[PDB]
Write an enzyme that holds these catalytic residues in place. Structure first.
Site, PDB file in Angstrom:
ATOM      1  N   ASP A   1      44.852  36.212  46.689  1.00 31.79           N
ATOM      2  CA  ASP A   1      46.343  36.249  46.569  1.00 31.79           C
ATOM      3  C   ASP A   1      46.552  37.040  45.187  1.00 31.79           C
ATOM      4  O   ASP A   1      45.629  37.243  44.363  1.00 31.79           O
ATOM      5  CB  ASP A   1      46.857  34.731  45.905  1.00 31.79           C
ATOM      6  CG  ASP A   1      47.804  33.885  46.754  1.00 31.79           C
ATOM      7  OD1 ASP A   1      48.879  34.470  46.599  1.00 31.79           O
ATOM      8  OD2 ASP A   1      47.445  33.057  47.422  1.00 31.79           O
TER       9      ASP A   1
ATOM     10  N   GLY B   1      38.268  50.485  39.565  1.00 31.09           N
ATOM     11  CA  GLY B   1      37.031  49.768  38.955  1.00 31.09           C
ATOM     12  C   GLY B   1      36.022  49.015  39.789  1.00 31.09           C
ATOM     13  O   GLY B   1      36.029  49.331  41.042  1.00 31.09           O
TER      14      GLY B   1
ATOM     15  N   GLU C   1      36.440  49.763  47.579  1.00 32.50           N
ATOM     16  CA  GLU C   1      38.035  49.851  48.317  1.00 32.50           C
ATOM     17  C   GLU C   1      38.774  48.581  48.134  1.00 32.50           C
ATOM     18  O   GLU C   1      38.650  47.639  48.954  1.00 32.50           O
ATOM     19  CB  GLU C   1      38.037  50.171  49.846  1.00 32.50           C
ATOM     20  CG  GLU C   1      37.776  51.766  49.590  1.00 32.50           C
ATOM     21  CD  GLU C   1      37.441  52.429  51.149  1.00 32.50           C
ATOM     22  OE1 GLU C   1      38.019  51.568  52.188  1.00 32.50           O
ATOM     23  OE2 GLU C   1      37.021  53.488  51.359  1.00 32.50           O
TER      24      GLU C   1
ATOM     25  N   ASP D   1      30.299  39.113  34.562  1.00 37.81           N
ATOM     26  CA  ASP D   1      30.811  40.388  34.585  1.00 37.81           C
ATOM     27  C   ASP D   1      32.483  40.043  33.633  1.00 37.81           C
ATOM     28  O   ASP D   1      33.371  40.638  34.045  1.00 37.81           O
ATOM     29  CB  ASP D   1      31.248  40.935  36.002  1.00 37.81           C
ATOM     30  CG  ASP D   1      31.462  42.544  35.664  1.00 37.81           C
ATOM     31  OD1 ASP D   1      31.166  43.118  34.673  1.00 37.81           O
ATOM     32  OD2 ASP D   1      32.179  43.064  36.777  1.00 37.81           O
TER      33      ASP D   1
ATOM     34  N   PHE E   1      33.793  50.094  42.000  1.00 36.93           N
ATOM     35  CA  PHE E   1      33.774  51.444  42.630  1.00 36.93           C
ATOM     36  C   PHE E   1      34.566  51.472  43.706  1.00 36.93           C
ATOM     37  O   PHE E   1      35.080  52.489  44.473  1.00 36.93           O
ATOM     38  CB  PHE E   1      32.531  52.153  42.506  1.00 36.93           C
ATOM     39  CG  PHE E   1      32.696  53.551  41.960  1.00 36.93           C
ATOM     40  CD1 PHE E   1      33.138  54.602  42.779  1.00 36.93           C
ATOM     41  CD2 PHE E   1      31.785  53.885  40.856  1.00 36.93           C
ATOM     42  CE1 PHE E   1      33.105  55.956  42.101  1.00 36.93           C
ATOM     43  CE2 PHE E   1      31.941  55.174  40.263  1.00 36.93           C
ATOM     44  CZ  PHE E   1      32.403  56.174  41.107  1.00 36.93           C
TER      45      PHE E   1
HETATM   46  C1  LIG Z   1      39.738  42.180  38.896  1.00 36.12           C
HETATM   47  O1  LIG Z   1      40.463  42.013  40.035  1.00 36.12           O
HETATM   48  C2  LIG Z   1      40.147  42.350  41.226  1.00 36.12           C
HETATM   49  C3  LIG Z   1      38.725  42.719  41.495  1.00 36.12           C
HETATM   50  C4  LIG Z   1      38.296  43.051  42.659  1.00 36.12           C
HETATM   51  F1  LIG Z   1      37.087  43.406  42.947  1.00 36.12           F
HETATM   52  C5  LIG Z   1      38.957  42.676  43.873  1.00 36.12           C
HETATM   53  C6  LIG Z   1      40.226  42.178  43.837  1.00 36.12           C
HETATM   54  C7  LIG Z   1      40.732  41.876  42.298  1.00 36.12           C
HETATM   55  C8  LIG Z   1      42.187  41.434  42.459  1.00 36.12           C
HETATM   56  C9  LIG Z   1      42.469  40.182  43.133  1.00 36.12           C
HETATM   57  C10 LIG Z   1      43.839  39.823  42.851  1.00 36.12           C
HETATM   58  N1  LIG Z   1      44.872  40.363  42.298  1.00 36.12           N
HETATM   59  C11 LIG Z   1      44.473  41.293  41.689  1.00 36.12           C
HETATM   60  N2  LIG Z   1      45.410  42.268  41.096  1.00 36.12           N
HETATM   61  C12 LIG Z   1      44.613  43.288  40.710  1.00 36.12           C
HETATM   62  C13 LIG Z   1      45.295  44.508  39.846  1.00 36.12           C
HETATM   63  C14 LIG Z   1      45.689  44.159  38.322  1.00 36.12           C
HETATM   64  C15 LIG Z   1      46.446  45.217  37.813  1.00 36.12           C
HETATM   65  C16 LIG Z   1      47.189  45.827  38.994  1.00 36.12           C
HETATM   66  N3  LIG Z   1      46.737  47.234  39.292  1.00 36.12           N
HETATM   67  C17 LIG Z   1      47.197  48.213  40.049  1.00 36.12           C
HETATM   68  C18 LIG Z   1      46.757  49.326  39.883  1.00 36.12           C
HETATM   69  O2  LIG Z   1      48.349  47.817  40.572  1.00 36.12           O
HETATM   70  C19 LIG Z   1      46.758  44.893  40.001  1.00 36.12           C
HETATM   71  N4  LIG Z   1      43.386  43.347  40.981  1.00 36.12           N
HETATM   72  C20 LIG Z   1      43.157  41.983  41.710  1.00 36.12           C
END
Ligand SMILES: COc1cc(F)ccc1-c1ccnc2nc([C@@H]3CC[C@@H](NC(C)=O)C3)[nH]c12
EC number: 2.7.11.22
Lengths: 298, 252
Positions: free
Chosen positions: A89, A22, A25, A134, A23
Site C-alpha cells: 500500500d 535507495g 526497481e 535497517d 538500489f
Molecule cells: C522505504 O520504502 C520502501 C522501500 C522499498 F524497498 C520498497 C517500497 C517502499 C515503499 C512502500 C510503500 N510506500 C512507499 N512510498 C515510498 C516513497 C516515500 C517517498 C516517496 N518518493 C517519491 C520519489 O515519490 C514515495 N516508498 C515506499
C-alpha cells in the site's frame, strides 16, 4: 498456460513513476480498476544461481507476519507472464524527504507523535521476534493521514535466545557501537540506537553522525556519547581515550525540550544492555507531558 | 484466506487430477509416492523431518490446483524440497538437490556431465518448477505442523517418552499417508495422533478434575466422534503400509 489463482499478473497495476532512489526497481503504481496507489518492488534476479532468492523468501515471510498500523502493508505478490513483485500500500512521504524539506515544519506535539508511532512499531516487530536491521529516516514512511509505517524489511531477520547473526547490517550513520565493534550476538537494541539517531534528526534536520568509514563512525560516536570504556560498557574489552558524554550538550541547541533530550540520551547509550527498550521509551515522560502528542498535518 | 487451503470431501473428490481422468485411489497413491520420494531425498540431503514435512504440505497443496497428469510427482518433489529447505533455514544447493533426486529416481543410471545440455536443462527445469510452486501457493510458505501441538498434549497428559515418540510417528505418517493436512487444522490432527497412539499403547488419559477431556484443552472443535472417525481412517491406511506399524509394535 498453467492455472494460477493466487498470483495475479502485475499488469493489473499501471506504473506511474520509478521511486527506487535507495538500489533496486521500486515503482509507484495505480490499480487499473480502483485507482488504489501501491508501491511495486521487483525481486532482483541479478547473479541468482540458486533459483528464487532466499533473501526474498525471508522478507516475504516477515512482511506476511507483521500486520500493524505502524508497519508497511504487503498487499500481495504479483508475477509477470519472468519477474516477481512485492506489492505494498503506497505512502506519499518518507521522514528523510520531509526532513530535507525547508517548507516542512514540525511542532513539538507532532515530533512526539512520530516518535510514538516509530517506537510502537518497534515494540510490535521485536515482540514478534523480528529485527529490522535497517533503521534510517528514508525507511520511515508517513501516509497522507499522518500514519507512520516502518518500511524496507529486506535486511530484516527473525531472532531468538550464543547467536551468530550477520554483522554487515545497518547503514553506517545509523549503525550502533556493538556492530562496529564486531558483535554477532545482537538483538532489539540495534534498532533502538537507530530510533535515537532518527529522533535527534527531527530537530537537527540532518543525520547527527555522518562517518565515511567504520573507524570514522566509531570516532564520531565517541565525540558524542563519550568513549568506549569497560567502566561505561562492562566487558566491552572483548579508538579515542579522553572523550566525555556530550549528547545533551551538542543537541542542547536544536532540541530545547528537557524530556526530548533525556529520551535521546537514553536511546544513544553505548552498552546495548543499558540502552532503553521500546516499552520503557514509550513510558518516558516525553510522551506524557505537555504539549501532549498530536495528529499530523505538517 | 483462513480456509483457502482447507477443502471439503467433495472438493477433494473433484480435484484437478480427477478432471484429467485420474481415479481417486490413483491420486492418493501419487501423493504417497511423492511423500516417500521427499523422505528419501530429505534423509540423503540431511535435511530435518520438519523440512520434509513442509515440502509434503507444499506438494499436497500444489496438487489441489495442479494435476498429476501435467506435473509428475518425480518432477515436483525435488523442486518442493529445494524450496522447503530454503524456507526452513536448511538451504541445499540446486546442483546438490539435482544430484540426489537423480540417484533416487535412477539408481543404476549415471549423472550426466555437468557441462551437457541435458544437465543444464534439468537445472533450469527445477528452477522453473520452483517458480510454478511459489505462484501456485500464492507465496504462502509458512506451514504449521501437528508436531508443534503434540508437544503441548504429551506434557498436558504426562505421556511416557514412548507415547510421545509414537504420537510424532503418527503426525509424520498422517502427512505421508493421508490428506488430513488439506482438511483439518494442525491442532486437530495433533489430537488424532495422540488418540491413536493411546489406543495403540493401551494408554488411557483420565478425565480432568473439571470433567473435561484432554482434547478440550487443545481444540474446541474437536469431538470424540470425529477423533474416532479420523483415528480409524489413519489406522486403516497404516495397516495397508508394509512394515510401517512394525516400527511402533511392541514385540516383547
Ligand atoms: C522505504 O520504502 C520502501 C522501500 C522499498 F524497498 C520498497 C517500497 C517502499 C515503499 C512502500 C510503500 N510506500 C512507499 N512510498 C515510498 C516513497 C516515500 C517517498 C516517496 N518518493 C517519491 C520519489 O515519490 C514515495 N516508498 C515506499
Amino acid at each position: 498456460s498453467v492455472e494460477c489463482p493466487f498470483c495475479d499478473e502485475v499488469s493489473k497495476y499501471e506504473k506511474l513513476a520509478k521511486i527506487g532512489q535507495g538500489f533496486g526497481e521500486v515503482f509507484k503504481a495505480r490499480h487499473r480498476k480502483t485507482g488504489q496507489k501501491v508501491a511495486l518492488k521487483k525481486v532482483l534476479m541479478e547473479n541468482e544461481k540458486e533459483g528464487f532468492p532466499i533473501t526474498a523468501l525471508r522478507e516475504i515471510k516477515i512482511l506476511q507476519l507483521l500486520k500493524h498500523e505502524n508497519v508497511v502493508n504487503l498487499i500481495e505478490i504479483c508475477r509477470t507472464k519472468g519477474s516477481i513483485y512485492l506489492v505494498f500500500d503506497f505512502c506519499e512521504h518518507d521522514l528523510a524527504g520531509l526532513l530535507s524539506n525547508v517548507l516542512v515544519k514540525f511542532t513539538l506535539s507532532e515530533i512526539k507523535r512520530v516518535m510514538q508511532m516509530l517506537l510502537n512499531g518497534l515494540y510490535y516487530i521485536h515482540r514478534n521476534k523480528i529485527l529490522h536491521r535497517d533503521m534510517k529516516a528514508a525507511n520511515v514512511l508517513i501516509t497522507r493521514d499522518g500514519v507512520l509505517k516502518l518500511a524496507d524489511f529486506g535486511l530484516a531477520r527473525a531472532f531468538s535466545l550464543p547467536n551468530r547473526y550477520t554483522n554487515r547490517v545497518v547503514t553506517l550513520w545509523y549503525r550502533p557501537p556493538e556492530l562496529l565493534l564486531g558483535e554477532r550476538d545482537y538483538g532489539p537494541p540495534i534498532d533502538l540506537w537507530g530510533a535515537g539517531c532518527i529522533m535527534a534528526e527531527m530537530w537537527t534536520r540532518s543525520p547527527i553522525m555522518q562517518g565515511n568509514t567504520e573507524q570514522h563512525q566509531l570516532a564520531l560516536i565517541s565525540q558524542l556519547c563519550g568513549s568506549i570504556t569497560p567502566e561505561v560498557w562492562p566487558n566491552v574489552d572483548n579508538l579515542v581515550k579522553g572523550q566525555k558524554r556530550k549528547v545533551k550538550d551538542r543537541l542542547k541547541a536544536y532540541v530545547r525540550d528537557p524530556y526530548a533530550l533525556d529520551l535521546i540520551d537514553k536511546l544513544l547509550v553505548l552498552d546495548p544492555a543499558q540502552r532503553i527498550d521500546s516499552d520503557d521509551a514509550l513510558n518516558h515522560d516525553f510522551f506524557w507531558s505537555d504539549p501532549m502528542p498530536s495528529d499530523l498535518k505538517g | 484466506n483462513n480456509k483457502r487451503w482447507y477443502f471439503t470431501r467433495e472438493q477433494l473428490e473433484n480435484s484437478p487430477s480427477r478432471r484429467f481422468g485420474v481415479d481417486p485411489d490413483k491420486e492418493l497413491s501419487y501423493r504417497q509416492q511423492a511423500a516417500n520420494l521427499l523422505q528419501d531425498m530429505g534423509q540423503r540431503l540431511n535435511v530435518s523431518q520438519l523440512t520434509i514435512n513442509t515440502a509434503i504440505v507444499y506438494m499436497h497443496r500444489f496438487y489441489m490446483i495442479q494435476s498429476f497428469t501435467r506435473f509428475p510427482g518425480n518432477s515436483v518433489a525435488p523442486a518442493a524440497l529445494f524450496l522447503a529447505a530454503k524456507v526452513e533455514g536448511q538451504p541445499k544447493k540446486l546442483e546438490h538437490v539435482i544430484k540426489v533426486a537423480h540417484t533416487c529416481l535412477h539408481p543404476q543410471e549415471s549423472l550426466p556431465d555437468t557441462r551437457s545440455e541435458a544437465y543444464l536443462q534439468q537445472v533450469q527445469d527445477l528452477v522453473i518448477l520452483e517458480s510454478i510452486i511459489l505462484q501456485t501457493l500464492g507465496f504462502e510458505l509458512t506451514i504449521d505442523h501437528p508436531h508443534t501441538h503434540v508437544v503441548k498434549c504429551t506434557q498436558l497428559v504426562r505421556a511416557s517418552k514412548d507415547l510421545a515418540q509414537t504420537s510424532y510417528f503418527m503426525a509424520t505418517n498422517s502427512l505421508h499417508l493421508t490428506t488430513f493436512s488439506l482438511q483439518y487444522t494442525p491442532p486437530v490432527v495433533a489430537c488424532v495422533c495422540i488418540h491413536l497412539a493411546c489406543k495403540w499403547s493401551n494408554w488411557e488419559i483420565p478425565v480432568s478434575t473439571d470433567g473435561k477431556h484432554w482434547w478440550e484443552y487443545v481444540d474446541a472443535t474437536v469431538t470424540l466422534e470425529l477423533l474416532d472417525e479420523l483415528t480409524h481412517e489413519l489406522l486403516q491406511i497404516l495397516e495397508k503400509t508394509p512394515n510401517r506399524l512394525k516400527r511402533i509394535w511392541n514385540w516383547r
